[PDB]
């Protein structure tokens, strides 16, 4: 079926120091909306929680419909053949993050196991000093180099407390076990408008919301 | 005033070999549409005319309105203070193009002088062997690092005769003589949906059309 | 002590398909030389073994001396405080590899656990159609953004059977538990000349050799 | 013949503001050394002169010998067939520089006409606030994608008064009118160790020195 609920185990390290969080959420697969509540399973995060935002669930594209039918993500959930996500994120100050997102399915419930590793963040930079204030709205571009692969790109920017934006070049592959349907492959590029919100009163517990909208035309 | 007509002198070199074209066009600054007819001032181009498409006029953003009023490009034409365009384009096969676009104004008529230099295109690649078939529709992202500068980015792809897409990472600065208005600076990022068409029966004469639409939300 | 011997478990996936190898090697920490024999723990690798070469042991920089004394890698082994390696590799045809290298120490013996994930390799590209013939000799650049971090960069190229090179932009962080010594930090950049050899007659059983030489001057 | 002397006209703009300098120099084509004295033809430069260092004469590789004979640059001067240089430089803070270097020859005298355009330098960044203190020694990598083209790459860093480095990804093509000799093409990659010095007490009058050494092995 289409998803109704999900859980996430997100873990890895930033600048060599481990982190680990767990949480659960819901979403509406007719509209590309999702919500997630997460908490650290040890102490508060030693880095800005905003650095995790694109890995939170964009993190569950099974909630994303396409304009005229199911997204390839949804189709791959429906027969449980699935897909894997691999990403590399290059920040303006030389730091980089790499991630691998993996899923299992139980009816309308998704379980995510997401490994996120970041290195090279300056100790005085906005990530390690908690100066990110929001993730800018984004447009993500998808092309399909072959019938089992989506290449997704965007320029990711955050606002910060001193007014400057903090930039990143984001690249991702989604690799499918079975070919995507012809009606998906025939419409390229596909764009996705992404909006997010994050609330956290401490660096230990987070509430995340997202809305995504696919479009190939205007 | 807003523009009605334009002319272009576009020149430079590809792989060390000079080219030079001139032409004239029109556009509708209420809708972000433009048309241009161009011809080589010597022989046919020795490279795919499609490689010139983003430099043709996106090349005249004075025809681009913003969602709630004039674009910064239009405002800068209205008092003739103007702006300059500088771009760097990195292709997947190692080649790169750099360009500088400059304008003068005479009432509702724009004159463009555009220098485009490309190097490192493989002699057997799709540019030098005329295998590009169309420029994919694009979404361009704008942010404003300061009141006189737009940083524009996108992933640019062409379709080719053998089915594969030909990729490029595009970066641009627009540098304004006078600050952009507060109402521009307050809405970031700004996105632009771009559609183009190119007709050419030989590599010597081209007809180009474009439609651009700014949006900050969906 | 300085290392004499090592073992490696290298695993991950390419284009969504798991691989796993184990092996053992030796090296000379006076000269930056190492040798490794590896065997797949299932069947032959489904991709060119040359794509792993950079992750085999550069993979054990505990064998690398510096010009005037121990490298930071060697010093970090001597007190077992250690370091972690994180890398991101962007190939010319859009594919990318990410990796995490981790070590444990038992006297003069090193154990490596290396996770390498690659995606987006075209099925007809040089990696998936065994076109890579050798890794070019390289010069790696090190700078130290802070006392616990090395940022390593190079342009990585392979020769291929198509008579062209296959290119990659390589970025790496080495993150140390304890600060590097002042004599290390005082000499930047540091360069490393790397030579490798890969012998194999099948894709399940590899023999790798390397020689590295550090230099800050000529 | 091999060069003994040179002159340079270097011009363009930074952040939309024109600059122009002229000067003269000498070098030793047996050793890859050069010296240049430059003066602004208006007032002092409005940006750090260190940002030009890479374009001063690496700027005259006709002074660079190769390990076993003339460099391709020297050979191309000997018959005056020549070469053109095109570069794109991406700085860490989003700014970029593009350049085109052109030469004419009169016996052992070279005349350079170099156009350098930079945009997007933050007004409070290291370039516009004179924080650059030296260009790090570099190793430049050359490969030859075809017999008329050198692709040159390096990671370029400056030290700064903030006690950090200011980074750039440098890419260049050298495009030759006639094919390079077989003895050049047969040895790849070729590396070049570069050292520079800049003396100035004001921003209108610069003294530049460089030493380059080619090597394919260690």
UniProtKB/TrEMBL annotation, chains A, B, C, D:
Keywords assigned by UniProt, alphabetized: Luminescence, Photoprotein
Lineage: superkingdom: Eukaryota
Family: Belongs to the GFP family.
Single Gene Ontology BP annotation: bioluminescence
UniProt protein name: Uncharacterized protein
């Amino acid at each position: 079926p289409l998803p109704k609920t999900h859980e996430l185990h997100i873990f890895g390290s930033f600048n060599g120091v481990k982190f680990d969080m767990v949480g659960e959420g819901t979403g509406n697969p007719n509209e590309g909306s999702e919500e997630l509540k997460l908490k650290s399973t040890n102490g508060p995060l030693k880095f800005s929680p905003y650095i995790l935002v694109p890995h939170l669930g964009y993190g569950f594209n099974q909630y994303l419909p396409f304009p005229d039918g199911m997204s390839p993500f949804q189709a791959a959930m429906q027969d449980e053949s699935g897909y894997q996500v691999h990403r590399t994120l290059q920040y303006e100050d030389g730091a980089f993050v790499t991630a691998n997102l993996r899923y299992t399915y139980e009816g309308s419930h998704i379980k995510g196991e997401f490994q996120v590793i970041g290195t090279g963040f300056p100790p005085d930079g906005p990530v390690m000093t908690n100066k990110l204030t929001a993730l800018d709205w984004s447009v993500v571009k998808f092309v399909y180099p072959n019938d089992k692969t989506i290449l997704s790109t965007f320029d990711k920017t955050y606002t910060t407390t001193d007014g400057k934006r903090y930039q990143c070049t984001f690249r991702e592959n989604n690799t499918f076990a079975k070919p995507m349907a012809a009606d998906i492959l025939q419409k390229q590029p596909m764009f996705i408008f992404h909006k997010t919100e994050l609330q956290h009163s401490n660096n230990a517990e987070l509430t995340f919301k997202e809305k995504q909208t696919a479009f190939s035309d205007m």
